[PDB]
Design a protein around this ligand. Structure first.
Ligand SMILES: COc1ccc2nc(O[C@@H]3C[C@H]4C(=O)N[C@]5(C(=O)NS(=O)(=O)C6(C)CC6)C[C@H]5/C=C\CCCCC[C@H](NC(=O)OC(C)(C)C)C(=O)N4C3)c(C(F)(F)F)nc2c1
Ligand SMILES: [Zn+2]
Length: 197
């Protein structure tokens, strides 16, 4: 028992900048500092924006602030704490059935508003800051207007699908792949997050 290890914290390592006319990824922490911050859980970096790039020791993905909660996928974060200036922060929501977790949104983040538009013309934001049009096809599915190899979507779970007005419609969960080409995506609808809240 004496040598039983602790899994580290999720760490914010960058963000997707949507504040201007041009979407772009920004790295805010390199690999070595990420490893150190995962073990201590103490991240003194200033957080900005709605979409964070996050990492564990073994995986990197996205997390999205909606109504004061930073949300991501359970298949990325598990039950992990997130690093913050005051130390590790415990999840406030965990739902494996939805592939969903959330923590209180970091000080300095900005939150998206849940969409009430009832629109089916959506936009997926990836970890490379690509803004991909997606037609909504059901409660939890949308089609890519321009299909792409799954390589282009890998690492973007936890990112948002947005409506034309920039509201949050859902959280990207899984790619529907045929022969390595993503023609559609599965997402956690924001209504599911609102109920969890
Ligand atoms: C115990 O609790 C659990 C444990 C494990 C779970 N594993 C789950 O699925 C896994 C992970 C998820 C994935 O790869 N996600 C993305 C990503 O980027 N992840 S990632 O950031 O790289 C990351 C791995 C986090 C670092 C957006 C994808 C981008 C590219 C696709 C790559 C090819 C994979 C295609 C596959 N497609 C699929 O399964 O499609 C159907 C329709 C569902 C069958 C798919 O997408 N995935 C398979 C799910 C889910 F299914 F709910 F998602 N729940 C879980 C609950
Ligand atoms: Zn909307």
């Amino acid at each position: 028992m004496a040598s039983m290890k602790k899994k580290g914290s999720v760490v914010i390592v960058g963000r997707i900048n949507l504040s201007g006319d041009t979407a772009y990824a920004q790295q805010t922490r390199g690999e070595e500092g990420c490893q150190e911050t995962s073990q201590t859980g103490r991240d003194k970096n200033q957080v900005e924006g709605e979409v964070q790039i996050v990492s564990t020791a073994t995986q990197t993905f996205l997390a999205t602030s909606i109504n004061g909660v930073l949300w991501t996928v359970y298949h990325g974060a598990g039950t992990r704490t997130i690093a913050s200036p005051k130390g590790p922060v415990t999840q406030m929501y965990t739902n494996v059935d939805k592939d969903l977790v959330g923590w209180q949104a970091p000080q300095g983040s900005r939150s998206l508003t849940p969409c009430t538009c009832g629109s089916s013309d959506l936009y997926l934001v990836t970890r490379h800051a690509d803004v991909i049009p997606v037609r909504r096809r059901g409660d939890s599915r949308g089609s890519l207007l321009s299909p792409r190899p799954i390589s282009y979507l890998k690492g973007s779970s936890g990112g948002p699908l947005l409506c034309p007005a920039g509201h949050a419609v859902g959280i990207f969960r899984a790619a529907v792949s045929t022969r390595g080409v993503a023609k559609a995506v599965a997402f956690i609808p924001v209504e599911s997050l609102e109920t969890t809240m």
